[PDB]
Amino acid sequence: SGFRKMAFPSGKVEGCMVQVTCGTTTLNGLWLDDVVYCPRAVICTSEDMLNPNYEDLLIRKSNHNFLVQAGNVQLRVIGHSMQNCVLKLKVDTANPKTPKYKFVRIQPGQTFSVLACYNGSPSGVYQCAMRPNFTIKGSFLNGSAGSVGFNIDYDCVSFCYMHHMELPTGVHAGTDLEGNFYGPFVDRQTAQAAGTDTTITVNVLAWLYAAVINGDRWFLNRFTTTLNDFNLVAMKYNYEPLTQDHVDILGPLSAQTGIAVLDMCASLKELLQNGMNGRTILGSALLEDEFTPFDVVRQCSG
């Protein structure tokens, strides 16, 4: 038992991380088969990063303008193209460490592991969630662009995030591995603001179930609520609305614990209305919303 913010083992991804330099700009790339993927920001002229014309900049590059290093080995780029906000560098060597993988675009509330890298080398691994406002609350410094987020529930590495940028509030924005940004953000240093963030209600409920599974019961109550009454309380606290799909997803946990979903919603309502009373749940004094129902089942699977 116990409950921790657990990331996936990062080895399968470490074996894919390279350094990409174009001109005076360096960031990380993801070397899968004979293609290195990285943010197209690497081709910016380190002067025009407000309104770069990436199509214009790329056609002026030669393959030999890109310096790709995998450890001591320099990889030869033999072609380059752009898919949305991601640059694809064809190299003459397939990565022998390429895992089984796929690219997946995730929904807000989904969680994933981040391998934070600098100059193609890993610094550390942590767990994140796609926020409702399509930012992620990462830990990234200059040079971290091209770090990726991933899941490995089985033997397949699901790449879902490539890091690009930090916003003024210190949260982060990036793309899927097809180069489409999450949210309305763009890979330009024009002023951009994240929308108001909200709490991922379905994840809070999953975590309350995780607490009951681990022996907590102090926050349970005799009350039940309707989905609409709960949703009226939730929006008053900047909580995401709960849908019937969420209720369905919470089914297995409600069955494993014997506590109906709307019975747990009433617990959440009381915690919101009356606070936590200086008490903790699973070692936290605030409600945690970056564990999904799937995360809870995986970590609490006997």
Binding site: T24, T26, S46, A145, E166, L167, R188, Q189
Partner: peptide, 10 residues
């Protein structure tokens, strides 16, 4: 801005 593409320069 305070909106930064987190590449590294030089």
């Amino acid at each position: 801005t305070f909106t930064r593409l987190q590449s590294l320069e030089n």
